[PDB]
Design a protein around this ligand. Structure first.
Ligand SMILES: O=C1CCN(c2ccccc2)N=C1c1ccnn1-c1ccccc1
Ligand SMILES: [Mg+2]
Ligand SMILES: [Zn+2]
Length: 313
């Protein structure tokens, strides 16, 4: 009960900032997650023994892939921590519990392949889940781990509160399907601009949490340039492996996934920042003004990709 997690001074200070990088010491990441749960939710939210067992089973069910790995899980959870900490009073007790867990679990058992590749491969998961294929799998893996003996971190919740938090987690994980982001943001834009956005409306809260999940999921584009640049290598390592596997199916992949077309990456990054990242953080900042640092960092990285094209690096 009186056992607090405490970080070294540099991490204690920098973990509060949106652009925090969790570092290369894998063995410190569970401690970093518990620290964030304790400050974001409370020391009483979870039984420490159960929470630690849950974290280590989640870690075990992330694969050794270049990008969609345990480090991504904890990085996305940290961005959610920074949003929740900068928006103290906007979220319920159940939301703050559910959302850090949703972020830690959101890519469980990822193989480094898109929904598109599973569909073209005719993977068993594409028959089980016709849309948001990997995201339905991630939620399924989350429920599986929660149901392991001694892993039910929600055991003190009532039957109805348990159903609510698992529904927050389900919607939050499904929302990380980038196919669904475009429509979600357009609706939030319309609601904000016509002034009809209402945070007491549950359908509206769901949409705002969805955009928060996109924002946290893409947060590699909101880090300092050296972090963003080096993370991009891991992202494209997966894309190019998917491209190789498309070529093995006798399908020319899109240029983004073709390692023969690396020269086209800088221009592809601009498209992504302009079509996905900047609009995401712009709408998030309109709804949650204290998340402005994410938009600023995103714009800084857009400027860096423009410099790569001009051959200034
Ligand atoms: O940087 C890039 C290149 C373009 N790209 C992308 C992804 C899907 C479809 C089209 C483009 N995504 C990113 C990116 C930045 C942060 N996260 N992600 C991301 C998101 C989902 C899967 C893998 C990576
Ligand atoms: Mg995902
Ligand atoms: Zn993700």
């Amino acid at each position: 009960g009186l056992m607090q997690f405490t970080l070294p001074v540099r991490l204690c200070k920098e973990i509060e900032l949106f652009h925090f990088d969790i570092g290369p010491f894998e063995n410190m990441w569970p401690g970093i997650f518990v620290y964030m749960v304790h400050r974001s939710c409370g020391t009483s939210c979870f039984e420490l023994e159960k929470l630690c067992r849950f974290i280590m089973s989640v870690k075990k069910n992330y694969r050794r892939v270049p990008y969609h790995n345990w480090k991504h899980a904890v990085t996305v959870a940290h961005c959610m921590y920074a949003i929740l900490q900068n928006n103290h009073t906007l979220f319920t007790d159940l939301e703050r519990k559910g959302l850090l867990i949703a972020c830690l679990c959101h890519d469980l058992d990822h193989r480094g392949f898109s929904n598109s590749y599973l569909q073209k491969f005719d993977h068993p998961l594409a028959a089980l889940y016709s849309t948001s294929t990997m995201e339905q799998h991630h939620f399924s893996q989350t429920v599986s781990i929660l149901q392991l003996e001694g892993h039910n971190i929600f055991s003190t919740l009532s039957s109805s509160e348990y159903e609510q938090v698992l529904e927050i987690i389900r919607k939050a994980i499904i929302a990380t399907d980038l196919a669904l982001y475009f429509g979600n943001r357009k609706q939030l834009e319309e609601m904000y601009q016509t002034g009809s956005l209402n945070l007491n409306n549950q359908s509206h809260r769901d949409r705002v949490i969805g955009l928060m999940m996109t924002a946290c999921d893409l947060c590699s584009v909101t880090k300092l340039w050296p972090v963003t640049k080096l993370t991009a290598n891991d992202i494209y390592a997966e894309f190019w492996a998917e491209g190789d596997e498309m070529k093995k199916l006798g399908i020319q992949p899109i240029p983004m996934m073709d390692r023969d077309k690396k020269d086209e990456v800088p221009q592809g990054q601009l498209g992504f920042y302009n079509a996905v990242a900047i609009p995401c953080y712009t709408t998030l900042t309109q709804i949650l003004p204290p998340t402005e640092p994410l938009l600023k960092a995103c714009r800084d990285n857009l400027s860096q990709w423009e410099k790569v094209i001009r051959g200034e690096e």
